[PDB]
């Protein structure tokens, strides 16, 4: 009912000549090699609306037909779309079939209303230690996760994904904003692995939807994908009535991208250089992510700093948002602490005494400060010496390590490669653990018991194991075995060890082939479109 | 050079030819991709591509961004 007036790039302004569809409708373009989808930005005049396209627009022709949809871009959501990859506009990109569609929702809704809203304030219990201690989750709140590469972050929003889906019941929306997909496909291979998602009869067994808008996508495709994910998680909480887990990976690659379509419609960049409407393009997303009186919405959503400048209008902007952070280090994660989450960086706003109770607030308040005056005497210990300071300075330093050593946990989705089985430790068993070694009852067990163990039931488990090995090593004894020719052979023998390399000069680089013959006449298109030749003068 | 394509939009050529030159370098790559063989694509001065790829927008009047440098 509508035709393609103009293409400038991803921009696109097609003409109705009936009704308009409204602001952010959704457009089909008939006839395209892709399915095109735009979404309707503006309306210009003169009875043109100008569209930002979820998909590439080149094949673009003006006067190719345009369906309204008559509604906003409408996604899958249901149990269906556990364990399946969707895109910004719903469709499988997991190539297993289609979704099955409990309902199609509009990806673009207002907030909860301010009635609707819950006026209370509590802690999201993830299982995890040092999560739930000294930077605790709100439930409906959203928690900015500071990782970044081999500091073990995938495994930790798996272990988030196990965690709320085994207690609290609620299932995962991982909406990846602008992810590369090498490793927006390393998150789907891990996650199979790890049982979070299942393939085939057991896919409803999944407890993650995956949202997905890659890198290679047009900057309107990437500044919907989080909204897509938005609405996948608010059926779980609107019907289904649940405790969801969000993950923006990357809330700055929604900013980037949104940035981007403001950019592409001619608007004027704000300060630095963003969208003017950055906070209301923000808080349009993030405020849909609350705690209603149906369930909950929880966003762990991951935050780069650009040009590490917190005061950037990206991230400053974000962090208005932001109810916790938890910072994942490479210094944590080479002293073999998993999660790597470091426990002074690590920030929540739910860390006061009025909603998380005085006895956990003192507890994790008097956690920070024991390893907090431990680091600041690291050049004390190197400079000058170890048993050169006072006895209570150290002991600080060895009830700080067996706190550094405790907040260390195995986890369940890791225990398919490690060996180790996962610990869910309750938030209880948390606080009581921590009371005692902040007081000193377990100042006379070693420091690698209170590693990689559930509670403080299992520290005593650790210690009583370990000193009797000492009992156990007696067994056998330890000396040298047939210094080197035991089964250590002669070079010239393992030079015939070598297998058999067959080296083709042919490099069998005609397999399947078509060899086009290319003339390198010009070839144009006469009046009937018929092809022809250049003709010859201007 | 028996193993090499040489894809080359030198200084001289237009805008829109080096702004095109990664892509039709990396079409003659992804040919070894799609038959089973291994590619390596070199794109030398990705920053050059867009500095004539910035040229284009300016020119066709595209709103300009951080750097003149198109959304």
Redesign the interface.
């Known amino acids: 009912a509508g035709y393609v007036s103009q293409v400038?790039?991803p921009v696109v302004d097609v003409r109705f000549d009936g009704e308009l569809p409204s602001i952010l409708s959704s457009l089909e373009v008939e006839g395209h090699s892709v399915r095109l989808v735009l979404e309707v930005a503006q309306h210009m005049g003169d009875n043109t609306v100008r569209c930002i396209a979820m998909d590439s627009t080149d094949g673009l022709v003006r006067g190719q037909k345009v369906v309204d949809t008559g509604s906003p871009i409408k996604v899958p959501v249901g149990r269906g779309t556990l364990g399946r990859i969707m895109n910004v506009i719903g469709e499988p990109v997991d190539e297993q079939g289609p979704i099955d569609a409990a309902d199609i929702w509009s990806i673009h809704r207002e907030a909860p209303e301010f009635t609707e809203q819950s006026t209370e304030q509590e802690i999201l219990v993830t299982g995890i230690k040092v999560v739930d201690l000294l930077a605790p989750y709100q439930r409906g709140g959203k928690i900015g996760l500071f990782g970044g590469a081999g500091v073990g972050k995938t495994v930790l929003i798996m272990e988030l994904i196990n965690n709320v889906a085994k207690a609290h019941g609620g299932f995962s929306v991982f909406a990846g904003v602008g992810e590369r997909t090498r490793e927006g496909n390393d998150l789907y291979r891990e996650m199979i692995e790890s049982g979070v998602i299942k393939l085939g009869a057991e896919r409803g067994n999944s407890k993650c939807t995956l949202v997905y808008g890659q890198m290679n996508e047009p900057?309107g495709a990437r500044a919907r994908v989080a909204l897509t994910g938005l609405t996948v998680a608010e059926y779980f909480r609107d019907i289904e009535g649940q405790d969801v887990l969000l993950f923006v990976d990357n809330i700055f690659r929604f900013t980037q991208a949104n940035?981007?379509?403001?950019?592409?419609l001619?608007?004027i960049?704000s300060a630095?250089?963003y969208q003017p409407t950055l906070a209301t393009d923000l808080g349009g997303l993030q405020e849909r992510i609350t705690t209603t009186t149906k369930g909950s919405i929880t966003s762990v959503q991951a935050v780069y700093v650009p040009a590490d400048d917190l005061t950037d209008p990206a991230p400053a902007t974000t962090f208005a948002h932001l109810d916790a952070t938890t910072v994942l280090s490479r210094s944590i994660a080479e002293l073999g602490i998993y999660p790597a989450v470091d426990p002074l960086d690590s920030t929540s706003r739910m860390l006061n005494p009025n909603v998380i109770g005085a006895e956990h607030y003192n507890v994790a308040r008097g956690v920070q400060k024991v390893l907090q005056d431990y680091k600041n005497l690291q050049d004390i210990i190197a400079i000058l010496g170890m048993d050169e300071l006072s006895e209570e300075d150290k002991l600080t330093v060895a009830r700080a390590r067996k706190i550094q050593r405790f907040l260390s946990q195995p986890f369940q989705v890791a225990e398919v490669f490690t060996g180790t089985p996962g610990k869910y430790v309750d938030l209880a068993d948390t606080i009581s653990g921590f009371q005692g070694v902040l007081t000193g009852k377990y100042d006379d067990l070693p420091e690698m018991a209170f590693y990689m163990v559930g509670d403080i039931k299992e520290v005593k488990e650790k210690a009583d194991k370990m000193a009797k090995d000492i009992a156990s090593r007696k067994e056998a004894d330890n000396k040298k075995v047939s210094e080197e020719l035991k089964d250590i052979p002669s070079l010239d023998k393992l030079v015939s060890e070598i297998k058999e390399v067959v080296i083709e000069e042919d490099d069998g680089?005609e397999?399947?082939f078509k060899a086009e013959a290319l003339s390198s006449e010009t070839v144009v298109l006469n009046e009937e479109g018929k092809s022809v030749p250049l003709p010859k003068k201007n | 050079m028996r193993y090499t394509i040489m894809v080359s939009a030198t200084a001289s050529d237009a805008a829109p030819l080096q702004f095109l030159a990664p892509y039709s370098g990396c079409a003659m790559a992804e040919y070894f991709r799609d038959?089973?063989?291994h590619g390596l694509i070199i794109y030398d001065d990705l920053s050059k591509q867009s500095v004539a790829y910035r040229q284009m927008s300016l020119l066709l009047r595209?709103?300009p961004?951080?750097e003149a440098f198109?959304?």
């Open positions: 400038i790039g900057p940035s981007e379509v403001s950019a592409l001619g608007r960049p630095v250089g680089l397999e399947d | 038959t089973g063989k595209r709103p961004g951080r198109p959304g």
